[PDB]
Design an enzyme around this catalytic site. Structure first.
Site, mmCIF file in Angstrom:
data_model
loop_
_atom_site.group_PDB
_atom_site.id
_atom_site.type_symbol
_atom_site.label_atom_id
_atom_site.label_comp_id
_atom_site.label_asym_id
_atom_site.label_seq_id
_atom_site.Cartn_x
_atom_site.Cartn_y
_atom_site.Cartn_z
ATOM 1 N N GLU A 173 0.812 -1.212 0.000
ATOM 2 C CA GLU A 173 0.000 0.000 0.000
ATOM 3 C C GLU A 173 0.851 1.270 0.000
ATOM 4 O O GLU A 173 0.503 2.255 -0.652
ATOM 5 C CB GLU A 173 -0.961 -0.003 1.192
ATOM 6 C CG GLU A 173 -1.943 -1.189 1.219
ATOM 7 C CD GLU A 173 -2.750 -1.346 -0.064
ATOM 8 O OE1 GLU A 173 -2.885 -0.359 -0.815
ATOM 9 O OE2 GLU A 173 -3.263 -2.460 -0.315
ATOM 10 N N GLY A 202 29.119 0.098 3.810
ATOM 11 C CA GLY A 202 30.237 -0.612 4.420
ATOM 12 C C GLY A 202 30.218 -2.078 4.021
ATOM 13 O O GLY A 202 29.504 -2.446 3.098
ATOM 14 N N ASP A 253 22.335 -2.521 -2.169
ATOM 15 C CA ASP A 253 23.540 -2.245 -1.394
ATOM 16 C C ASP A 253 24.345 -1.236 -2.199
ATOM 17 O O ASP A 253 24.571 -1.443 -3.390
ATOM 18 C CB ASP A 253 24.313 -3.548 -1.200
ATOM 19 C CG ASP A 253 25.491 -3.383 -0.299
ATOM 20 O OD1 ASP A 253 26.386 -2.592 -0.664
ATOM 21 O OD2 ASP A 253 25.521 -4.032 0.770
ATOM 22 N N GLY A 260 25.851 -23.748 2.770
ATOM 23 C CA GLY A 260 25.560 -24.471 4.000
ATOM 24 C C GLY A 260 26.128 -25.878 3.998
ATOM 25 O O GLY A 260 27.129 -26.125 3.346
ATOM 26 N N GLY A 270 34.144 -17.345 -12.079
ATOM 27 C CA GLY A 270 33.829 -16.402 -13.138
ATOM 28 C C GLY A 270 35.042 -15.522 -13.380
ATOM 29 O O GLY A 270 36.143 -15.917 -13.036
ATOM 30 N N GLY A 295 37.691 -12.263 -12.920
ATOM 31 C CA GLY A 295 38.245 -11.707 -11.693
ATOM 32 C C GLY A 295 39.110 -12.696 -10.928
ATOM 33 O O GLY A 295 39.118 -13.883 -11.226
ATOM 34 N N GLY A 302 36.488 -24.972 -0.891
ATOM 35 C CA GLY A 302 35.510 -26.021 -1.086
ATOM 36 C C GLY A 302 34.864 -26.439 0.217
ATOM 37 O O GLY A 302 33.671 -26.717 0.244
HETATM 38 CA CA LIG Z 1 32.139 -28.647 0.444
HETATM 39 CA CA LIG Z 2 27.658 -2.867 1.538
HETATM 40 CA CA LIG Z 3 27.778 -26.867 1.009
HETATM 41 CA CA LIG Z 4 38.077 -16.107 -11.539
HETATM 42 CA CA LIG Z 5 36.483 -30.313 -0.269
HETATM 43 CA CA LIG Z 6 34.640 -13.567 -9.878
HETATM 44 CA CA LIG Z 7 29.738 -4.572 -2.854
HETATM 45 ZN ZN LIG Z 8 -2.661 -2.713 -4.549
#
Ligand SMILES: [Ca+2]
Ligand SMILES: [Ca+2]
Ligand SMILES: [Ca+2]
Ligand SMILES: [Ca+2]
Ligand SMILES: [Ca+2]
Ligand SMILES: [Ca+2]
Ligand SMILES: [Ca+2]
Ligand SMILES: [Zn+2]
Length: 462
Positions: A172, A250, A280, A329, A356, A358, A364
């Site tokens: 709202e 931060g 952020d 996790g 990726g 960078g 692991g």
């Molecule tokens: Ca692992």
């Molecule tokens: Ca931040």
């Molecule tokens: Ca894991």
């Molecule tokens: Ca990389």
């Molecule tokens: Ca491992």
């Molecule tokens: Ca990366």
């Molecule tokens: Ca950042």
């Molecule tokens: Zn609405």
């Protein structure tokens, strides 16, 4: 062309909920974040007037203690209780966190841009226990910016314990700021449904201004309601008032061990669900999803969705945001980084990590993990990756992606110069193993992954 299953799991997850372009989802036109934002702001109205964009605003809000009349005709006015006031303030904060808005409370006879009040009966004076809430767009007319809620709904009276109440406040307030439903539909008017949606992304997964559940787009929040602006909402509100670049500048942690002081970004324990789109504005940030045992899929790319804590499509990163680190996790997770330098921690369980572009640092954790490389640009000598806890005979480094340029040949201690060869070099002095890859088309050795520990030829997937 024959990539491994690990590579494929990353490749597919990167395209999770693709949108825009000339795609068709659920038989509907697919909208990009910006197209959705334009649709949500189609009324082209805000507190700064009409067709005014990227302009900040200082607004006032008020909890009505009495009324001359409710603009809708409803009756049985009831003022906000203490819990409603606290939750409404949190909803206001979730909007000012992302857009250049400031909210100041006023009392007494002072007028206010946005107001809050409850109703309990209709214009005929009969009890109304069926409706939920509504609000009025910004403007100079009587009642503009006012929001109203049905006090006969327990979720409205107890927004702190009944999630839909908090979501309704955010929704709202969205209207009171100038946002509209993603489609031309209203409550009570006919029986609209997701089938009436103008575009595929019209669901709670992308906008809390929607009327449709996240399940309509393939997400699943297991009965929970996020309560804060989602990805398209953030783009929409910023289109009107500009982005707030002073928020969490931060090093911010989202999820477990959060330092955000925002309930919707915080998980106190494993039994807590997370539903949010993160905004952020600076710093080195971390997605700490370490307290879960469910298999998770975490993507740090801006605009992307993740599967966190057993839910599906419950976490996203707003456009214009860079999140740097992620912690999985105890489940078997998939962690995908972005072009920035990322620190990825898989945790226990058998995980698939993808840095990726960078210079990334990968852990692991316990378990049989796989570190995936899909391009020579993933780990150049000038900005190489570090795999800090590699386990010889247990973990794997996946280079199957290079098969497209010809099967990689493993050499023991020297390159022939022919190309497409991989070598492992052990430095006893520092206990570091350098993984070198001489790629086809490269006159020099330009790919390097440094490993803190030993590694065997059989640990490298070519
Ligand atoms: Ca692992
Ligand atoms: Ca931040
Ligand atoms: Ca894991
Ligand atoms: Ca990389
Ligand atoms: Ca491992
Ligand atoms: Ca990366
Ligand atoms: Ca950042
Ligand atoms: Zn609405």
């Amino acid at each position: 062309a024959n990539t491994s299953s690990a590579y494929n799991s990353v490749y597919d997850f990167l395209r999770y909920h693709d949108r825009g372009d000339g795609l068709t989802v659920n038989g509907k036109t697919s909208y990009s974040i910006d197209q959705a934002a334009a649709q949500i702001t189609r009324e082209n109205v805000s507190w700064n007037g009409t067709n005014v964009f990227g302009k900040s605003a200082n607004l006032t809000f008020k909890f009505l203690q009495s009324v001359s009349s409710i603009p809708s005709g409803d009756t049985g006015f009831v003022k906000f209780n203490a819990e409603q006031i606290e939750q409404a303030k949190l909803s206001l904060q979730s909007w000012s966190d992302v857009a250049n808005l400031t909210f100041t409370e006023v009392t007494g006879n002072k007028s206010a841009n946005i107001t809050f009040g409850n109703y309990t009966r209709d214009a005929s004076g009969n009890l109304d226990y069926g409706t939920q809430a509504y609000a009025y767009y910004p403007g100079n007319y009587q009642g503009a910016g006012s929001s109203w809620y049905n006090y006969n709904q327990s979720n409205i009276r107890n927004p702190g314990s009944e999630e839909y109440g908090r979501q309704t406040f955010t929704h709202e307030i969205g209207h009171a700021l100038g946002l509209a439903h993603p489609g031309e539909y209203n409550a009570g008017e006919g029986d609209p449904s997701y089938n009436d949606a103008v575009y595929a992304e019209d669901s709670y997964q992308f906008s809390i201004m929607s009327f449709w559940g996240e399940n309509e787009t393939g997400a699943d929040y297991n009965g929970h309601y996020g309560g804060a602006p989602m990805i398209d909402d953030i783009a929409a509100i910023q289109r009107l008032y500009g982005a707030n670049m002073t928020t969490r500048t931060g090093d911010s942690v989202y999820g477990f061990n959060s330092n955000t002081d925002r309930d919707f970004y915080t998980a106190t324990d494993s039994s807590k669900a997370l539903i949010f789109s993160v905004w952020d504005a600076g710093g080195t940030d971390t997605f700490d999803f370490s307290g879960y045992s469910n298999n998770q899929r975490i993507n740090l790319n801006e605009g992307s969705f993740s599967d966190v804590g057993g839910l599906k499509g419950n976490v996203s990163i707003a456009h214009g945001v860079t999140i740097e680190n992620a912690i999985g996790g105890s489940g078997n997770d998939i962690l995908v980084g972005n072009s920035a330098d990322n620190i990825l921690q898989g945790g226990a369980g058998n995980d698939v990590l993808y840095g990726g572009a960078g210079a990334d640092t990968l852990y692991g954790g316990a378990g049989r993990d796989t570190f995936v490389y899909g391009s020579g640009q993933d780990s150049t000598v000038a900005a190489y990756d570090w795999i800090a806890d590699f386990q010889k005979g247990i973990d794997k480094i996946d280079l199957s992606a290079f098969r497209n340029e010809g099967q990689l040949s493993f050499v023991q201690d020297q390159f022939t110069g022919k190309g497409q060869e991989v070598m492992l070099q052990w430095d006893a002095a520092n206990s570091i193993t350098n993984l070198w890859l001489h790629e086809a088309g490269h006159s020099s050795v330009d790919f390097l992954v440094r490993i803190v520990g030993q590694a065997a030829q059989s640990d490298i997937i070519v």
